[PDB]
Design a protein around this ligand. Structure first.
Ligand SMILES: Nc1ncnc2c1ncn2[C@@H]1O[C@H](CSCC[C@H](N)C(=O)O)[C@@H](O)[C@H]1O
Length: 261
């Protein structure tokens, strides 16, 4: 019954053509051409991002939605876009990335952008069964889309359930993907987490319209229900006018080399 649940229903009614167009309507996208060429060539010293994720985290970081400091842990690191971005920040002292990296799941990519030497990647790891570790900055970018809102809700609550174990260890900063913030059980869990750990959910402009994902971050505090519905309204306006118009932006280029001394 929430606006988001209606959005899901309408989204499933779209055909292949409509979906493609709607998905990119009025969104921002980084140009990945150069990065893809460099990675295909096996270049590791050009500072290009291993995934579109680097730009996503940069957006939150550059405007204070999440501070990247001290010991960073990245749950569901995949290729490592967030790990490399974090590793390049002077305030960060170490980065530990964990991901499944198997049976189709993306494995950590090895490049040598600034601070690559302070990153420890660990694949073949299900973060839902990983014993929480003390850290200062907790990142998690997990959440698989589903045509079923019930399923997206289940997946989102599971992620929040696991993340709560890590936040309970005491963390200063966090940025966690919330796949389906529009589901009522999720809204309630977010309200409870907000009272316990602070923060709020923010929509990243680089997210495609095909997902209602928002990120639970430590750098701001606001009315969760209100802001989730603001995004539901935006997503629905875009479905009524699916122009497929995209705004291209320059991708992230990080410094290179090891952080030493
Ligand atoms: N239970 C789990 N444990 C560990 N990793 C998981 C997981 N479920 C999903 N994942 C992984 O989480 C990743 C989400 S995509 C993460 C992209 C990353 N932020 C970047 O910037 O590149 C995927 O690789 C997915 O395979």
């Amino acid at each position: 019954k929430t606006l988001g649940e209606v959005w899901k229903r309408e989204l499933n009614l779209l055909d292949k053509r409509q979906f493609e167009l709607y998905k990119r309507t009025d969104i921002v996208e980084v140009d990945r051409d150069t990065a893809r060429r460099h990675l295909a060539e096996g270049k590791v010293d050009t500072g290009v991002a291993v995934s579109r994720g680097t730009a996503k985290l940069r957006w939150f970081h550059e405007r204070g939605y999440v501070k990247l400091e001290g010991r960073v842990i990245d749950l569901g690191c995949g290729r490592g876009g967030w790990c490399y971005y974090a590793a390049a920040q002077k305030e960060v002292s170490g980065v530990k990335g964990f991901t499944l990296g198997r049976d189709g799941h993306e494995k950590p990519m090895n490049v040598q952008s600034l601070g690559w030497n302070i990153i420890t990647f660990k694949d073949k790891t299900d973060i839902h069964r990983l014993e929480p570790v003390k850290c200062d900055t907790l990142l998690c970018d997990i959440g698989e889309s589903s045509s079923s809102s019930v399923t997206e809700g289940e997946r989102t609550v599971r992620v929040l359930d696991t993340v709560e174990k890590w936040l309970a260890c005491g963390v200063d900063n966090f940025c966690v993907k919330v796949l389906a913030p529009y589901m009522p059980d999720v809204l309630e869990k977010l309200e409870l987490l907000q009272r316990r750990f602070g923060g709020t959910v923010i929509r990243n402009p680089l997210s495609r319209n095909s997902t209602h994902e928002m990120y639970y971050v430590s750098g701001a505090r606001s009315n969760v229900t209100f802001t989730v519905n603001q995004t539901s309204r935006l997503l629905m306006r875009r479905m009524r006018r699916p122009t497929g118009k995209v705004t291209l932006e320059a991708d992230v280029i990080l410094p290179i080399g090891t952080r030493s001394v």
